Design a binder for this molecule. Structure first.
Ligand code: MG
Lengths: 479, 478
């Protein structure tokens, strides 16, 4: 009975995590979900990493989900010779769909996204590398787009382009994405994230490609486009077509304003939890730790306010994939989460006043959380669920308490590793009813989670039938 | 045009004297300039005060001046050369006798001669915001033997903190006493007291200012574990203060950067509950000392302090010593405006269950209740010669602008700190509804209000020399 971190940590893999024994150290420091970024590496790199993740998990007795993250369309500026100059005034600058590796410097670079000329009209603003360069388009002729500076700076190889506001029509699933879905299906990823989705139909397309390959992974919608957050209908359309919502702040904040991002993040987290979906807060939470062994105060406050906003999880990218302190960044991130979770605000719920359920399992989950949060002496909620679904519904409700999700399936335990406050715990008993319940309570005891006097809320499916699911709460005393 | 409500406090220094940067930072929207007595001579601050009042009279703006005492210098003194060190169990020593004798081989001087009797075997000293650490082994006489544990570079004059509370240094130094006299000569609007353990410290500073002829409003820098250890300690500090400053630098290093979020939030809420203003302080956009754009985490930090309900957000080096002082101010402003649209920070419970025993506070509260719930209201106008109704009304979350109408320059500069408050000079010689409508028409003629608009006005209307604000008016423009 030590306080358990509730907020979950997603960590991208890469060179920094293959080198030495770092992957193992980042799992030990507390990673719950490992992210494979298909933007880099080859299928054999990702497959080899998947084997070493599962082996390390087996050895450490940890439950670690695998997330596969699709690249989506490369809307970048391609490559020069290596003269990354660009000035500040009103120089002209060309973007030419037809151009290979001619140095920018002047007014020329190629575009990987051939379709940009159809998508921009004079007076549109293109932000390059998150806005550290900007350009105003004067004219579009054929596959050439003639822009002027506005703001300036350094312009390196393959840096991204975002249109201010929505606008581009590049298709979400690139051919590389279809191949990579086949790879994530072979690896058997637990979650599969779709870049640049326009609406929910893009997500349905990716989910079917995954199905046709044999993979029923849960879909993470990457919310990176002004088009996804421009109205509550748009936002609901994306979320409902997802199993997990990923709040991807880099591109999304460049398109709409960086100030308007804070409202939008809070709104997406709140809506995801209302629709019984989990949510990741992502990009580069603790950027400064690519380089330095300690976070920025601002980075701490960022992570902590994501925690207080209701996020299931927070994500590291280059910090763990390419940085100097992979396990250290995890350790720090975990400390920030533990800190922020003490704040009374994120411990209390209204318990969905004015919400009506039409689902017995959700009723059980909601009334168990209500009992749990208000009964003196409760120290844990236990969800015996082979699908994980009770754990998802209970974790939608804020609380200081740990939720223990008991299942016999590796896929369910891995799955639940992403959920807020959920500790997946392997359980395979042959008992049912109160015997299974008490055997789970005593297993949790033997592991250190419960003490001999505690009260525990238990949710279970008990019926004389093959029809139906979780329909039972028990309030038991340990030992 | 929708107006910014969160105020911006900008520290002065080399980068503000240079070129015409002071005026630029004022034009971009600085509402309070901060003179940091840790650096510079008294004549530098006197010069800058003249320059700020010149620029503000020029631009028709009201800019408050805040003076920030240095407090005790708990630092590492200096050494010949020694800006580097390794440590996986290495020994280090602090000895209070030393002027400039080498870091490495475990020696440096302490400027706070009282550190050895405050550390006890097992204590950790975090140096340079914890970038180096030390665990204390032994202390004999005025020497303190430690081992290094966490390490790195140790430059000149870097600070020391004890993990948790502990240190017993006096809050008001002799330098602080000299500088309280300088701040009195300048005539600062706000005066910030470093390292206060309890309200008594603030009371000492305030008497020193009083003896010097200075009635500045006192700003408690909350930098110490001892100040947030309990709700009683926190109230003791806040009640002795006029303004609360969440000084995240030292306090974070003392209680742990994680605990700092909830402490900041607590401190802001309690400040506002007790009818004081609050400033979230130090290095809010650190990145822009060097880079022309802020870090996304800095934007997140800033906007969440807005949502937390701060009166003001503060820039240090960004404006005193950086390359982009006016541009940092403008970035900070855009973030503030963006964050202020979030419904969260626009809406109030209007102090359910709270009872007033002050007519003026009740007038301010019913004023804001009306203003926030009457369709077509576009401004609240507090007619107040002290500003006290502006302080009170602005305690209440709203999207609406509060125009604070006084005839006194010190009241307008004072209120420049208050969240959502725009000071406007007004001096009518008419009374009652006359001066009321005169003020409304001034605000319309200045472009602030449109002819259809409804406004809420608070003032004092009574045929007596007894009392203050006691009236609310809901008027229609033109
Ligand atoms: Mg699969």
């Amino acid at each position: 009975s030590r306080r358990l971190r509730r907020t979950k940590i997603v960590t991208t893999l890469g060179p920094a995590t293959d080198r030495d024994n770092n992957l193992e150290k980042v799992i030990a420091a507390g990673a719950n979900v490992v992210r494979m970024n298909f933007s880099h590496g080859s299928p054999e790199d990702h497959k080899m990493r998947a084997d070493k993740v599962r082996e390390i998990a087996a050895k450490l007795g940890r439950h670690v989900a695998i997330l596969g993250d699709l690249q989506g369309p490369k809307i970048r500026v391609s490559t020069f010779k290596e003269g990354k100059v660009f000035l500040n005034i009103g120089d002209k600058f060309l973007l030419d769909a037809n151009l290979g590796k001619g140095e920018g410097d002047k007014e020329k670079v190629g575009i990987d996204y051939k379709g940009l000329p159809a998508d921009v009209v004079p007076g549109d603003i293109l932000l390059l590398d998150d806005g550290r360069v900007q350009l105003k388009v004067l004219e579009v002729q054929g596959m050439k787009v003639f822009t002027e500076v506005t703001v300036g700076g350094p312009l390196s190889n393959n840096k991204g382009i975002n249109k201010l506001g929505g606008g581009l029509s590049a298709e979400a699933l690139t051919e590389k994405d279809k191949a990579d879905i086949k790879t994530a299906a072979l690896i058997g990823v637990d979650y599969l994230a779709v870049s640049f989705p326009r609406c929910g139909e893009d997500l349905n397309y990716a989910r079917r490609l995954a199905r046709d390959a044999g993979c029923d992974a849960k879909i993470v919608a990457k919310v990176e486009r002004a088009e996804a957050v421009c109205s509550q209908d748009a936002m609901d359309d994306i979320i409902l077509a997802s199993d997990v919502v990923m709040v991807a702040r880099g591109d999304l904040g460049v398109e709409i304003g960086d100030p308007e991002l804070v409202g939008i993040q809070k709104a997406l987290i709140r809506r995801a939890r209302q629709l019984n979906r989990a949510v990741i807060t992502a990009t580069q939470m603790m950027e400064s730790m690519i380089t330095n062994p300690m976070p920025t105060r601002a980075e701490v406050m960022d992570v902590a306010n994501a925690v207080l906003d209701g996020t299931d999880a927070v994500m590291l990218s280059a910090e763990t994939a390419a940085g100097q302190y992979p396990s250290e960044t995890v350790a720090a991130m975990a400390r920030v989460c533990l800190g922020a979770e003490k704040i009374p605000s994120i411990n209390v719920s209204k318990h969905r006043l004015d919400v009506q359920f039409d689902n017995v399992e959700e009723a059980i989950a909601m009334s168990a959380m209500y009992a749990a949060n208000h009964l003196k002496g409760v120290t844990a909620i236990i969800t015996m669920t082979e699908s994980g679904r009770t754990a998802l519904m209970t974790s939608r409700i804020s609380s200081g308490l740990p939720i223990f999700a008991m299942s016999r399936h590796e896929r369910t335990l891995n799955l639940t590793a992403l959920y807020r406050g959920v500790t997946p715990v392997h359980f395979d008993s042959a008992n049912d009813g109160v015997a299974a319940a008490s055997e789970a309570v005593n297993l949790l005891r033997d592991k250190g989670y419960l003490m001999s006097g505690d009260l525990v809320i238990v949710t279970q499916g008990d019926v004389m039938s093959t029809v139906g699911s979780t329909n039972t709460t028990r309030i038991l005393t340990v030992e």
